[PDB]
Amino acid sequence: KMLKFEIKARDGAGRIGKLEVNGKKIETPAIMPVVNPKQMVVEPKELEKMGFEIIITNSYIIYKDEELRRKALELGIHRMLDYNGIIEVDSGSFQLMKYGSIEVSNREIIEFQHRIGVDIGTFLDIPTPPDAPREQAVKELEITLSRAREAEEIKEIPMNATIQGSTYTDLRRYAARRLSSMNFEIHPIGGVVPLLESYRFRDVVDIVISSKMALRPDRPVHLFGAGHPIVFALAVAMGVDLFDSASYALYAKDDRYMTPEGTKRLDELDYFPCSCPVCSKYTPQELREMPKEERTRLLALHNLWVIKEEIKRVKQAIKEGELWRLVDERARSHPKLYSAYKRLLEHYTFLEEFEPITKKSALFKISNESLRWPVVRRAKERAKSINERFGELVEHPIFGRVSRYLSLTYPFAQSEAEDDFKIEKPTKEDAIKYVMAIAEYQFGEGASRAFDDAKVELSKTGMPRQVKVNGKRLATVRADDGLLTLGIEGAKRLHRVLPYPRMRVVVNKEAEPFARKGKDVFAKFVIFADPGIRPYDEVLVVNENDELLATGQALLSGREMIVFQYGRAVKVRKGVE
Amino acid sequence: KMLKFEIKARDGAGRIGKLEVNGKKIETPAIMPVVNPKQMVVEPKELEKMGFEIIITNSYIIYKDEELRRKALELGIHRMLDYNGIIEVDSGSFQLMKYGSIEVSNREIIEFQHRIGVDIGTFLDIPTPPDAPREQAVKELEITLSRAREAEEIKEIPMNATIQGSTYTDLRRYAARRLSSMNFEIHPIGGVVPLLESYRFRDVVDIVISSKMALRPDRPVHLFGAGHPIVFALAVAMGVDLFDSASYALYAKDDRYMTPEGTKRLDELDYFPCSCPVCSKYTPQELREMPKEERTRLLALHNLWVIKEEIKRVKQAIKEGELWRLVDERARSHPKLYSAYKRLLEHYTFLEEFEPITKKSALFKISNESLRWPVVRRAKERAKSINERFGELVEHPIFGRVSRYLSLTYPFAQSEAEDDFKIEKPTKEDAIKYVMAIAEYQFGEGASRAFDDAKVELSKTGMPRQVKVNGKRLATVRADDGLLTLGIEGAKRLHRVLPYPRMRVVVNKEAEPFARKGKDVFAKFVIFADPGIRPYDEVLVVNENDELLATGQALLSGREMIVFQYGRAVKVRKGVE
Ligand SMILES: Nc1nc2[nH]cnc2c(=O)[nH]1
Ligand SMILES: [Mg+2]
Ligand SMILES: [Mg+2]
């Protein structure tokens, strides 16, 4: 294990992760600028100063140039580029996609990558073009897989194992499942460059989702060639963690200027809709008259700033549970991106497994699409049975109508549309009915039976809070989302009222003592867990004998908990000890 | 004539304008930072260095303070504030909002503003709150207008005549009519601060449109209190040319960070979604540790950069003919903004009057609301008749079905949605049918009768270009928009086929010679024009006797050509004499 990856925060199918490679730590989503070893528009040391702690170069281009190879073998790529962050390197597969044949063998560049002290390498995977004869897509993929097995045998460093299969979702699934069973640390998704250039974002969505579906969750995903800000928000919402960009430099040499919404020709710019170091002091009409070398430099820097800025924007949105809103905003950039956005939302089943149970932000109805967001479709179905049971429905701008008993609970209460939703507070005789409704809603069918005989306390306002029964607190309704926070007593009740494995996270014999003491539960110790658990659900920490050890909040889905070996699986609230 | 205002470019009902006062020019849309004479987070000279060439201060406050009072009379605000740009001042009406009455008379402040060398003054209009009872909306408006009448009498400086009818569109209309008929140079729209602070943007749209409907198009409109980047694109699209902001500073004082999509609390920021001098330099945490004063300063500056940046973004979009696409993107920032955006599109009649006829940018189907854009509804309606005659209905992504004869013309041809639309090139036999369908579509019913007996000469590609008869070239189908550019001969024919005033722009007797000569028609010399004329339409430059003087392209709407006293109204292609 030379590569460690763990989730720190999440939204949609996206996540902010901590990625460690042989001692170097980087936060994802992240973009690695592509550096041309022959003509570096922006010096690696300057990229590093700008905050780019990971970059990529062409080991093949280096290998072929006598001078470059000599220096790379003499000082290592790090000293050669005078860069200290993570240096990822490509294999020359891109030259393969352009010329068909390359003058170096898979084993050869791999060994070369090792010789120059590369942080992360890549083998000669074949980038089958889109809409290619299924025959070619298969023949090429098998070679890719063969070259992969070879790389798995000789690699001594972290390496990229790229998924191919052209535009055939079944080949994608196959590639993903196969490379997922091999010893590799990162899984790029290739062959998409031509799609991105053509703005065929819908096809990329299909390729990306089919790949993510078959890929094991705990490994970072890299979208090869997605180096333009316009796709960041969407790609990250699908679960992409890494991006690489050469366009920042190539566009600059073409007097092309990037924007989160697309690209513009410098000669069509009357104003700079940006405030970066470059745009804050210069002007379109000035830049246009500068020496090309200078014009290229300033554009490159600008492009890098906008790319860096989008990433930060995306991470900040994930942090506040607003990614979908941002994605919705960026979808209006281009008709094709809008097409791709609608398509992504059709994949409710894939998206639903990762969609957090509760978010910081309120549900915003800002378009027709938002009514199709994962959280909306989930709350709809989960409320159906709660309505035909508790009745007393009220009107809701977004969900139409929902029982007054869920009106204080996310996302019904925690949402906003064109018109405002009037939440109906409980009564002294009503309270418990709410707690029961929430339980049945948050924990599933039967959960109320753990609270029936309880007494709900009300705050200075008519809001439900502390839930008690013949003593100790069973749980508490949160003010922030109207969801229940389990106390050890309430956890015990749920445990006996709900059959195994509902709400369970089964831990290591070794992990048992810690959970009992209330320490947090770490993924590597989770041997099994309820497949229904969603990020942020209340959870029952248990041993194999299903004995309650503690209660806490999930940070991963049931499945992820099993698969993941790094990061916390559960944030424990209280233990049995 | 103490204020000149010219339209330099436009889109939607918005416009980029040239505003001159005291020989000081400024480009609009423009936002004026509100400056507090007592406390200044950022100082006028700094604001001037940042590029804010217009600001606003509270003359009443300056008045009520001995210190400022002396220095003001003594030095005159310009030197007092060490600012050399346009300085606008407010009456003290703001204090009226929160105090209901002040210790100064309409006449007193007005004369005081005159004494301190103010570039633009304001009288004591009463900012009636959003949903006041009708008797109050009415009472205060009459009081406002009496002060308007007094101000018009003694005025010796350009002044803001604020439209003030609360939330009664009929009162706004009246209020606008009256002030328009009076001698003032700028028209703010007031009583909206309470609405903006409550994100009640839909109500602001209704108030603005009802005001704009009754305002003289040639005068600048100012949305009083609209100082957050969130409403700019929307507001500009409604024809608002000026904004003032106090928020950039006040928000900073409460560690609130501005964004084109809204507002963020500093203690809730993990990353800065911006590249400005501040954000590209510091991190959220680095900011939180600084002393309150430094924090307030840096945040205030950041807010100013966001403001400045959105404006440049809005102006760039107008120049590109993509304002609506931006409004749409921005509509996704908040449910209340989305509600307002949809409402704005309900006001088709108002918007269509100012909406240009042809654009450089292609029509993008990026949302549901995209289908309700002015250009789309206009195209649908107009084409109905063409589809009824020339038939040959071909499929279209946005309009569904449309006669093939218009498939070469804007906005049908370039249009792009989830799937591209393929154009139908003419046959040497259908050629004429196209020129006729286009004419009927571009010039209105009957227009075709001016081209029936003509031959359409196709180019290197099966595209129609020059239209000739007997040897004289009537017009020529443009390659870019598929719209006809008239030739003096085509002009003549249309002149007799279409009943006055269709396509007519009537000029002075003094302008008659130039027009005949071929010179461009300036607005001030236009006495009357076809209400149906839209920006960029082909127009018939005629004299009062309806005698053809020349042909050209409109740069304003017919209604605008009449009221406007500055700028060109028609770019003449060719005179007659
Ligand atoms: N290895 C590799 N590099 C790429 N660069 C762009 N696309 C690809 C791809 O599919 N694979
Ligand atoms: Mg595990
Ligand atoms: Mg005129």
Ligand SMILES: [Zn+2]
């Ligand atoms: Zn920039």
Ligand SMILES: [Zn+2]
């Ligand atoms: Zn900033």
